[PDB]
Each structure stands twice: as structure tokens, then as C-alpha cells.
């Protein structure tokens, strides 16, 4: 067979003739794509018409043709311009490829704007529809019940809000021990993976806050965070929680690791600020 009759049937005036013709193309859109590439400006013409009512399939047929050639770039753009046809993409396991590329496209754009603005996924600088597909992939991963795939994808596109929402639903205080391991998998990650000064700082900070919300935690864990950011104001808050939860044993154990590991500059500033908290001279 050849798909050339279907393209010829596009040219005829009735809308009814053309809508049927585009569907026939879809049966053999990756399976007989050769002619469609050459006569491609017709399918695009039908998208550009606003009186044509099967715009959505014309954008899809086009999308597919650009995917087959090797031209990933325009396949993604047309993906978002269909205005749907994302249902098709879940029911196609041989082309989740362009779904993947939509992630690539988000993460390059996200990283670009991160340096110049704190947020840009709230602003209209990034296209909302491209954003929607991104968050959709992160859910798919969690439909397989793996949190590991979801934090991975989220990290790149510099989303703090997804990272928080993910940790939070899988924290329920099943055990005190079990909440810490996930956070520690994350803390060590942000140190060795994200070399970005600003985004790394935000992640470490949200991990302090989840254990800080808990009434009982590994404080051992929290100590790592203090030292790497090399910030006295974090430790100052940690000792204040401990003031009202005091034990002769618990205090002494955190303090011994802390003075060893902490830097010289850090320790000078801190002993000043603990006097104003009213904390004991024994700590000092």
C-alpha cells in the first residue's frame, strides 16, 4: 500500500473527507511515514486552519513524522500543540521516547532560569503545558511504587516543592529511625550531585525542617547539615530544641562529635550566640 491517496483526499473541500483521511494515516504513521514527510506542509496547513476541527490529530500526525526522521525537537513542540493526544502516548509503549525528551527540554530550560530567578515555574517564562508533562512522568514512577525514580527526575528540573511533597507523604512516623534514612539518602546526594550553590542550600534546609518538625529524630544527622553549610544560626536552633528536651546523656553525645567535626571559625561565632540563648556554660 501507499498512503498517497489519503494525502490526496486532504485536498478535497469537505471537512468530512479530510477527517476520515487523517485517521487512516494514523494506522500506519510509523509504519508508512515516507510519503507524509514530503507532503507534510499540508498537515501543518490543516493545524493552522481554525475552521478544521481535527487539528488535534493533524498535530499528532506531524509529531510522529518528526520523531521518525530523527528530529526529536519538533516532535516535542507539536506534542504540546495538539492540546491533548497525551492519552495516546500512555497507550504507546514504543514511543514514550518523546515523553522523555519533554523532560530534557524542561531541565535545560529550568537550570537556565534558576540562576537569574528563584522561581520561574510560577512565572509564564516556561510554558505551563510542558510543565504538566514533567510532573506527570514523576507520578508514573510512583504508580510503580518507587520514590527513588521520582526524586531523581524532580532534582534536575529544580523543583523543591515536588521534592517536599514526595518526602512528606512517605513520612508518617512509622518509626523514628525510618524517617532519617530517606533524608540521609538525600543529604549525601545534594553534596555530591548538585554543585549549584543555591539549590543545594534550599534542599539541605528543607531536610533540617522535616526532622525539626519531629519531636524525636537522629540529631546526628542534623549535625552533618550544620557543618557543610557552615552556618551558626542552624546549630543555635538545634540547641534550643534540646534545651527543652534535656538529658545528661543525649546532650553530651551530640556535643562531642560536634566539636570535632566543626570548623574553627564556626565555633567562635556560636559560643557568643549560645550565651544570649541562656544555655549553660558547660556547653560552652
Amino acid at each position: 500500500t501507499t498512503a498517497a491517496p489519503l494525502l490526496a483526499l486532504l485536498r478535497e473541500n469537505q471537512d468530512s473527507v479530510k477527517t476520515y483521511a487523517l485517521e487512516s494515516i494514523n494506522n500506519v504513521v510509523d509504519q508508512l511515514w515516507s510519503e507524509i514527510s514530503n507532503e507534510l506542509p499540508d498537515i501543518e496547513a490543516l493545524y493552522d486552519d481554525d475552521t478544521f476541527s481535527d487539528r488535534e490529530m493533524a498535530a499528532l500526525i506531524a509529531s510522529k513524522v518528526y520523531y521518525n526522521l530523527g528530529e526529536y525537537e519538533s516532535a516535542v513542540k507539536y506534542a504540546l500543540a495538539a492540546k491533548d493526544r497525551f492519552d495516546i502516548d500512555e497507550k504507546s509503549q514504543f514511543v514514550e521516547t518523546i515523553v522523555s525528551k519533554s523532560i530534557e527540554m524542561y531541565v535545560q530550560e529550568a537550570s537556565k532560569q534558576y540562576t537569574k530567578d528563584e522561581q520561574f515555574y510560577t512565572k509564564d517564562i516556561i510554558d505551563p503545558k510542558l510543565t504538566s508533562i514533567f510532573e506527570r512522568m514523576i507520578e508514573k514512577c510512583l504508580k510503580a511504587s518507587e520514590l527513588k525514580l521520582a526524586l531523581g527526575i524532580a532534582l534536575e528540573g529544580y523543583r523543591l516543592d515536588i521534592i517536599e511533597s514526595a518526602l512528606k507523604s512517605k513520612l508518617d512516623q512509622d518509626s523514628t529511625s525510618e524517617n532519617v534514612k530517606i533524608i540521609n539518602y538525600l543529604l549525601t546526594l545534594a553534596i555530591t550531585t548538585v554543585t549549584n550553590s543555591k539549590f543545594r542550600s534550599s534542599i539541605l534546609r528543607k531536610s533540617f525542617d522535616f526532622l525539626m518538625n519531629m519531636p524525636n529524630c537522629d540529631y546526628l544527622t542534623l549535625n552533618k547539615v550544620v557543618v557543610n553549610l557552615n552556618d551558626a544560626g542552624l546549630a543555635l536552633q538545634l540547641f534550643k530544641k534540646l534545651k527543652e528536651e534535656n538529658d545528661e546523656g543525649l546532650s553530651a553525645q551530640i556535643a562531642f562529635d560536634l566539636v570535632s567535626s566543626a570548623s574553627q571559625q564556626l565555633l567562635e561565632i556560636l559560643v557568643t550566640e549560645l550565651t544570649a540563648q541562656g544555655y549553660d556554660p558547660a556547653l560552652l
Binding site: 498517497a4 491517496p5 494525502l7 490526496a8 473541500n13 469537505q14 473527507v17
Partner: protein
Amino acid sequence: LTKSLSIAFENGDYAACEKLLPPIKIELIKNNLLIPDLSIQNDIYLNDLMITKRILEVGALASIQTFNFDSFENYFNQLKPYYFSNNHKLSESDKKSKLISLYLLNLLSQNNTTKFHSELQYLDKHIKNLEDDSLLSYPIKLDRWLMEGSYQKAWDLLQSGSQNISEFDSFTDILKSAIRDEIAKNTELSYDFLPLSNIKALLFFNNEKETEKFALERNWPIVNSKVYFNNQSKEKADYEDEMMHEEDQKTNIIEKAMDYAISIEN
């Protein structure tokens, strides 16, 4: 519905058929849904396919006479997979030979022999042997006479077109002007000036005045009954040959020396 086309055709109005053909293409959707679209053709599906076939052939023939090249292209295309499917189920009709000849005439009349040879390799298997040559003979011999530059045979073929006259006339007019054009292209380089009567003879006209009218269209001055290519040939080639996308690429002598140079030390 389908019978409206049928009676319109016999009557001799091909405008009536043309404008009336798109309402019928609504009914060609439904026809298509009855059959499996050539993944099997039984005698259950053959009577249903006969109508789809019957409507497409006869639309092709009306369109050539009313000069709708556009509509012609539609038919051309659709017709192909129906003839192509099976060795014989419904792949045999007299109008099959008829249409094959017209499609090919149409490829010559655009003056692009590339679309012709592509079609010719596709035709040479089943289709060409099955129908045999018996109007196929015509567009194939013609084309051959054009590779040769034997326009005496090519021009002669048009005349023998009279015997099968129906709608081959709508291409023959296009072909004459082209046959005359190919000769004029040749005459420029061959020689430079010729008496009026010898140019007439070559370009095929029965009157000296019709020769000078084709002169003015092809932008060539006959003065004192003599054509000149010493000016003209050089002029036309220059305006065309002026381009700014491969004229800054010629490959300099200087450029070639440099190019060699770096290959030796790298």
C-alpha cells in the same frame, strides 16, 4: 446516489459529474468501512469494491477533459492500490489500460521524465504484462523518441492519436509546445543563424508568420529573415547562471593549495 454519476457520464456533461463527485465521496467512506481495505477480497466484498472502483475510474476521465489536473491527481493515486492488490480479483478492466496511458501522458506533459521512469518500473511487472501494451505502446515509444532527439517520430505519434480520440487531445496540445521547445533548446548550440524557411521546417509550422510569433515568445530576434544566437544564448545563460549560493563556491586555486597543506602536517 452512485447512479447519478453513471447517467451523467453517458450523457456527455463532464462538469455535471465533477461538481457532483464530492457528495459521492461521503458515500465512499461507508463503502470503505464495509470492506477490510484489501486485506482480503471475497465475492462478498467484490460487489461492494466494484462500486468504489467504478466511481474512481469514471471521475478520472471527466477531470482530464475539464482540465482539473488537481482532481486527476486524486484519482491517479487512489487507483494505484486497488489495481496493485492481488494478481486478479478486480484488477482487470479495459479502463485500466485507458487510464494507465493517460497518467503517463500527464508525466511527459509536465516535462519531468524522472516521474515517468519511476512509474515505468512500477508498471513493468504484473500490470503492464496483464493488460499487455495496446495503448501503453503510445506514451512509452514517445518518451523513447525524446531520449533519442528523434522529434520526427515524436511529433508523428501525436497525429496517430486521432484514431483513439476521446480525451488524449487534452494532453497532445501541451506535448506539441514542449516538443517545439526541446528543438529550440537544441538549435541554439547547434548553429547560430538560419534562413526563415529552414527554421519553419524544423519547429513545425505551415506558415512563415507562426514561426516569428514563437520567435518573440522565446525571445529571439528574426531580422532580415535570420535568427541569431550569438547575442541571445549567452544572455539567457547569464541571467540564470547569476545565483548567490554557489557562485561564492567555485573552489579557488588559493583555497586548494591551503586545503592540501594541512593534510600533510596533521
